[PDB]
Structures are given as C-alpha cells and as structure tokens.
Amino acid sequence: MNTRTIYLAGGSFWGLEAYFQRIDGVVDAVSGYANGNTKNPSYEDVSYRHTGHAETVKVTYDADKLSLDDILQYFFRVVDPTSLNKQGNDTGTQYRSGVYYTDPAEKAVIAAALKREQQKYQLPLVVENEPLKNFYDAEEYHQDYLIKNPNGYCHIDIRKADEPLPG
Numbered sequence: 312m313n314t315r316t317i318y319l320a321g322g323s324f325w326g327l328e329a330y331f332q333r334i335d336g337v338v339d340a341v342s343g344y345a346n347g348n349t350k351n352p353s354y355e356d357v358s359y360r361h362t363g364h365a366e367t368v369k370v371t372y373d374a375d376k377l378s379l380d381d382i383l384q385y386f387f388r389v390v391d392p393t394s395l396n397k398q399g400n401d402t403g404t405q406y407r408s409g410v411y412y413t414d415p416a417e418k419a420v421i422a423a424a425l426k427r428e429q430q431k432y433q434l435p436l437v438v439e440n441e442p443l444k445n446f447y448d449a450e451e452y453h454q455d456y457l458i459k460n461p462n463g464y465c466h467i468d469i470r471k472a473d474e475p476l477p478g
C-alpha cells in the first residue's frame with residue numbers, strides 16, 4: 312500500500328480518532344500529543360502542567376484512495392475552525408485546532424484548503440498550519456477509546472464520515 316500520514320488536532324482525540332477510523336481509505340489513527348515543549352508527556356502533563364502539547368490524531372491513509380485534500384475536507388466537517396482553544400466543553404490550548412505536516416510541500420496544500428474553507432465562514436479561521444515538531448503516543452488506554460467504550464464522551468457526529476466527497 313502507498314500510504315501517507317498527516318497530523319490533525321481538533322479537540323478531544325477520542326471522537327476525532329473514532330471519526331477517521333470509520334473512513335474508507337484510512338489505514339490507521341493514533342491518538343497522541345503534538346507540538347509541545349516537553350518530551351514523552353503523560354495525559355496529566357498535557358492537561359495540567361501546560362506542556363503545550365495539543366491532543367492530536369496521527370492519520371495514516373491510502374494515498375491511492377484519498378488525497379491529503381480529502382482528509383482535510385473530512386476534518387473540516389467535524390472541527391469548528393473558528394473557535395480558539397475550544398471545541399464543545401473541551402477548553403484549553405490542548406484542544407486547539409491544527410494541521411501538522413512532515414513534508415514542507417504540504418503547507419501550501421493545507422493553506423489553500425484553509426483559504427477555500429474560509430470562503431464559507433464569516434468569522435476568521437484560527438486553525439494552525441505548521442510542521443509536526445514533535446509527536447508522542449498517548450497512553451494505550453486512550454487508543455480506540457470509542458471502540459472500547461461506545462457510550463464514551465464524544466461531541467462530534469461521526470456519522471458525517473459516511474457522506475461521500477465531491478466526485
């Protein structure tokens with residue numbers, strides 16, 4: 312398989328992970344902590360010590376089935392790109408919205424996508440578009456959280472992932 316990876320931050324990684332895991336073309340989704348100032352942070356560090364990390368989902372997708380653009384469109388369906396450090400009740404910099412890339416050629420792709428998304432929003436978009444500085448896997452307890460606990464905390468509607476994309 313020809314795969315690619317992209318890092319997405321859009322609030323609680325429980326809902327976001329579950330969301331991307333149900334999309335045909337997504338090979339994997341790992342919840343972790345990205346672009347922080349500390350190394351190997353625990354949930355407690357990120358949540359209370361202000362290590363600066365953002366709850367992020369590492370998404371691996373079939374580069375032959377989906378484009379980075381498709382992934383971004385899916386992402387825009389469940390993330391409010393206009394709220395600063397807040398998605399639902401999850402408030403704090405650890406829930407900031409952002410797209411982190413490992414390839415510099417993707418910055419222009421992400422920026423262009425954000426510009427198109429901005430066309431349909433009256434309020435200014437506040438989604439970060441930055442390189443993946445650092446990524447650290449969240450505790451195993453957090454992996455496949457909603458698959459293990461179907462009635463677990465989730466404020467995004469994962470059924471939006473079933474709706475097809477243009478053409």
Ligand SMILES: CNC(=O)[C@H](CC[S@](C)=O)NC(C)=O
Nearest residue numbers: 322323324325366400401464
């Ligand atoms: C009980 N609810 C929570 O713990 C969620 C955190 C889940 S997120 C994947 O960090 N937030 C609050 C405020 O309770």
